[model samples]
Target: MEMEKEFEQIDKSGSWAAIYQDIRHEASDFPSRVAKLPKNKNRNRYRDVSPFDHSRIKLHQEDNDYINASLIKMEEAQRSYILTQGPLPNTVGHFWEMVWEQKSRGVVMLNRVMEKGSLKCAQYWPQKEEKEMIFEDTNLKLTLISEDIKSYYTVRQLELENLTTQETREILHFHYTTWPDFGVPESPASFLNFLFKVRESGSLSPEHGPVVVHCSAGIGRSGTFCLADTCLLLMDKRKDPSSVDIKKVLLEMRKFRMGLIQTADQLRFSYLAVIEGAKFIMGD
Candidate 1:
């Protein structure tokens, strides 16, 4: 029997642990051949964490177009999310290159430049006003136009200039500054407050290139965001939150990228996010 009790059953029955294990069993062991290419070897932020070849995004280069990023598309949710590793200094040019080519309007960063005592990612974006960072390799210049700082997150407007073509595009950078490594959000509403702000910009929609989402490795926090967002959207469209299966949604996502929702807590948090968000959509 394909039981339709997904939303409440998994949590109320305390079956989340069991369901996560089941999803892990189907986690695709797809070949990440492109990520292993010697020419593209050093482009990765984390050595072991790589985007599966089939689902990884291409940077429009002739020979070595690879970047440590994956495209997770959920037609049901009507979004194609670019889940990518944080930029290493060497890959900064390529990072902007991918965003430009894909026409991505928003970049969602879930972690800070440095987490704890370790340096998680490079300072990829320009930090101050009137300061512009130009990526010669990609022929792009980025300038910070404005910033709105919240208690937990910050919103930034960036101008991406194509130095060669003399064209420009405005991009939104949504940064969640306080997320703990391997930990859950303080609450779903706190997280959704930021999530809804980004969604409201229509940056995550199909009209734009897949909205770029990243943490250090791009699987844990990034994947959790996509899962919660997609689950809530599917539930809204179906008119039945109970009919949407989190495990199935996760499995479909993993097929597009390797090792999504790394820890048990991330999986649990995603469920809570959808459950919390569902109230606004389907009502209590």
Candidate 2:
């Protein structure tokens, strides 16, 4: 069963009938519900990127709150790792690319920290021996490393090389997707390894204490990735912790970016991915 594309309103300035008609056009069918608008736009953006909200720890700190104004999520322990929601290809790129000759350079933080990598959208096309899901034919390649990725913390190594050669660039573009009911099978661990590789390359290293993350829409999938990594960072800092409930953490993440996961199903899957991802980190 292919999942339907959902429609979100620009604002709550219309009637239910109007909303219903608009949704029919957007989905080509129908959606389940019309989500409510957020009280805070910035906070909404964060939750929009993370799927769940969990900011009780930062609500009291002005610096943390200040950072929340623009960026979506950051690693609790290593302030250097930060994830930002990319511009919507529709709102910005689709339109601006035709207008702004300079690429609409909007205070993009640092050109040095953002580098384009195919890793963001690559997925297992054939499924090889994977299972089937709504949007996927074979189950996602969660444990891109092994045929097995059910348990937590499966360690998989990754390699990153300069794209100077066709072979090297092909390898660099290599990627696998996983529909982790939990954080991200061994694939995410391997992804983390790739991040380290990115860091070592010194191309977009987080020298000032934050790395950027983004995908097609800045919400849902992208949100889950940031949320998982942030939780991993927290767990790494508190080595004594047997487990840090990510569901609890996500509640805070939502405050930073509303509609973070975009859908309850996606958010649930992300929640599972983080917990299992932790096990992978701990060698469980």
Candidate 3:
């Protein structure tokens, strides 16, 4: 692939923001009616970021099924991603409900519980010593079975059970600890190292549900992760590897959800990440 050459050309031209605006212009103005409902108001972490009505994930409950979540499917890449906000205090159980019903392999958390001296995400899971956490509203329990901590990321094993059905499934928690709110990664290789670690689990395969990915608002870093990983996959499978238009891939993804790739920096970082990853992918 000519990913490096393309990136150098864009960098030389200083056209990252220009390219981002073109994508933003095309992906905006989608309706988020369901997200605007009064009852669902508290479910959103940031009022400005909402999932579109068409692709929002619905919870199976007697009460309202609304949750600030969206499903992104790229048929060509054979990739499926459940993009959502970091769990709000009131919506934690519904967050777990989405996990259980989706039958996903793991939860990919890209933000910390607190950052920039503000509460960025709810502490939804249990501490290792705490052993377990129960969400009575959802009839679900999360047990901290084990964990392998790393410098920048941690892979945790969680046992999710439905108390009513006495059914349980083990899922991974791919917690990326270093990324900041509204900021791109300091290094693309740093983020890619964690992404490759997530792939090692094989949890992202089609046999399971889509991997749930979330950041503070579930668009900036979340969108970067999906686009970077999926673009790498397409580059590997296509006959003309270097011909893939990444902005179009994100545009197609934005159809399912809104406001992905929040900043020009995030878009540029996506290009950097894909280029770094292609080194290993194209070598095969």
- Higher-ranked by TM-score: 1 or 3: 3
lDDT of each: 0.86, 0.36, 0.89
Clashing pairs in 1: none
Q: What is the C-alpha RMSD of each candidate to the true structure, in Å?
A: 2.3, 17.1, 1.6
Error of 2 at 82 (Å): 5.5
Residue-wise C-alpha lDDT for candidate 3, range 53-138, written one tens digit per residue: 88889999878999999999899999999999999899999999999999999889998888988898889999874768999999
Candidate 3 to truth, TM? 0.96
Over the stretch 1-284, how does candidate 2's per-residue lDDT look in tens digits?
Answer: 00111112212332435533432233211121111133234332223233222321122223222122224444454433233343322222211111111111111111111225322322211243243212121111121223322232122222212222322111111122333433334334544554344435442334332333444344456566666666766777875654565555555554554445555445444545665566666687
State TM-scores per candidate. 0.93, 0.39, 0.96
Would you give me the overall lDDT of model 1? Answer: 0.86
Say which candidate scores most in lDDT: 3
Local accuracy of candidate 1 as per-residue lDDT tens digits, 92-158: 9999999999999999999999777899999999989878999998899999999999998999999
Q: After superposition, how far is residue 277 of candidate 1 from its true place, in Å?
A: 0.5
Candidate that beats the other on TM-score, 1 or 2, i.e. the better one? 1
Candidate 1 lowest-lDDT run of ten: 1-10
| Sequence-dependent TM-score of model 1 | 0.93
Candidate 2's C-alpha runs over 4 A off are 1-69, 73-75, 80-206
